[PDB]
Design a binder for this molecule. Structure first.
Ligand SMILES: CCCCOc1nc(NCCN2CCOCC2)c2ncn(Cc3c(F)cccc3F)c2n1
Ligand SMILES: CCCCOc1nc(NCCN2CCOCC2)c2ncn(Cc3c(F)cccc3F)c2n1
Ligand SMILES: N[C@H](CCC(=O)O)C(=O)O
Ligand SMILES: N[C@H](CCC(=O)O)C(=O)O
Lengths: 269, 266
């Protein structure tokens, strides 16, 4: 632009995720931060990250972060709970721009909303094995009881378009019975895909349990940071994928309500 | 950073915010100042509230606090920007976190806020919300009788319930799905307000949201207390009667034998 580069605050916020699931976080940014320009990258060619070794996830997440940094983003959001669980500390420490992940904001919202100090979190194998949630919660409130439960079947339920089905209900109930002795009043949906399962999880957990949406809370934290440092955009979005642009578009355009949404396939390896 | 978080308010009402900090931030040491001798701020001119708020901030600054929370919505409405710009420590108020929470929770894009005359006159809520998410319709309503109801201690009475119903009658009609409790005192009225608005209106507690934000900021600025109990007690200061402050605070916070000191400002 004639100015040279864009004004710092006019640059995009970047979001990285293992695929299309992270569009639950992006959709929250469209809602809560409509003035911001967004650049999204999903590593669909290597999804899922859930079951992968931490070292692989850190590598792949760095490749995504490096790609978006070159696009002059003013802030990076690691939209993926699995990537946040193992990669956030290192990436945050290494970059000069704000870096936020999706675990801490959910943890803090859970501490805020709990009344009985019994909190659960569900997520991928990798997320839960990292113990990141237990650490994020107990760093601030060490006496809270935290129960962490991997739900590996949940991502595939959403991917197969069965997230409203009888099968979904049976699988969720079968898995979540592992929580039932813990007296929880709060459950963190610690995975990008779980908002699509929210009504099923709520039915299983009942009316006394408050569910926490990772993207919703993380986007609220982004909003806070933008305002605090006066770097909000003054009153198109870009989509990148390592898989098929068309297959990305079919999920995204409708999910997000952007009719002429075009995605671009890129290579990271 | 082992130094205290400071909280300032026009009186004892801001202990609704402090109570949230005890719950969400139990590792942190707190210093609270309430300007009881000049409470209420609600009906005062902006300029006067700014001066008083500066006096409070300056008093806690001398106590080596690492962060300042303006717990009072009325004070936040007029004084936050200038105090934040001037001080060498982070400063947070109670308005923006409520505004952000309301943007997050609304589904129908119809949000209300209630507060003192001062808070509502400032238009801080409307400005904050419209600068972030301008699709939202914001209804702002001053509720001048509410602080007196809570100050009277008779905030669960038939008289109180009638006044809340009368005051919010027009607001009930707006089809809101979210209502910000934009005043330190209003958590005390929350069940009555929820009964009047209906179970489908999500109420936003300023203090609860603000402390959640403080928690995130302590980690972001890398100034959180170590994960253990502090070694020095919380401290409580008032420009009114310490005896009265103690009686209210010990009961409300569940800290028996809490002690406060009376200080002078201005
Ligand atoms: C926004 C959450 C996305 C959840 O994640 C996700 N991933 C898919 N596919 C994964 C592999 N694809 C990805 C695209 O590149 C090629 C390979 C889905 N297919 C149907 N639905 C179900 C579905 C849908 F079909 C539309 C909207 C939402 C949704 F969950 C899917 N949801
Ligand atoms: C912060 C909420 C505190 C609510 O709790 C509380 N406790 C009190 N006293 C302690 C209870 N004792 C009193 C003597 O008999 C035995 C019990 C109060 N006195 C006035 N206000 C009312 C009041 C108020 F609720 C807010 C601000 C100012 C105020 F006076 C009080 N509110
Ligand atoms: N995006 C991942 C879910 C899919 C995956 O396993 O990569 C998460 O949020 O945990
Ligand atoms: N603390 C004030 C209410 C009491 C007053 O009017 O000073 C507020 O939050 O608006």
């Amino acid at each position: 632009v004639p100015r040279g580069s864009h004004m710092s605050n006019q640059e995009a916020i970047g979001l990285i995720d293992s695929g299309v699931g992270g569009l639950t976080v992006l959709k929250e940014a469209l809602k809560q931060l409509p003035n911001e320009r967004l650049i999204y990258l999903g590593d669909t060619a290597r999804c899922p990250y859930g079951p992968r070794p931490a070292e692989q996830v850190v590598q792949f997440t760095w490749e995504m972060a490096d790609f978006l940094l070159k696009k002059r983003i003013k802030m990076l959001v690691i939209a993926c709970n699995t990537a946040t669980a193992v990669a956030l500390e290192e990436i945050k420490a290494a970059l000069p721009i704000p870096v936020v992940g999706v675990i801490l904001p959910g943890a803090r919202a859970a501490v805020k909303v709990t009344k009985n100090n019994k909190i659960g979190v569900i997520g991928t194998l990798g997320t839960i094995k990292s113990a990141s949630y237990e650490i994020a919660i107990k760093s601030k409130a060490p006496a809270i009881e935290v129960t962490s439960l991997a739900c590996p079947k949940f991502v595939p339920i959403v991917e197969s378009n069965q997230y409203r089905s009888s099968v979904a209900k049976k699988i969720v109930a079968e898995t979540l019975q592992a929580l039932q002795l813990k007296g929880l009043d709060t459950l963190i949906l610690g995975c990008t895909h779980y908002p699509l399962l929210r009504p099923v999880i709520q039915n299983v957990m009942g009316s006394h349990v408050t569910l926490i949406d990772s993207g919703a809370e993380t986007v609220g934290e982004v909003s806070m940071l933008l305002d605090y440092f006066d770097i909000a955009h003054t009153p198109p979005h870009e989509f990148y994928t390592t898989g098929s642009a068309k297959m990305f578009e079919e999920i995204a355009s409708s999910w997000l309500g952007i009719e002429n949404l075009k995605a671009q396939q890129i290579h990271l390896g």
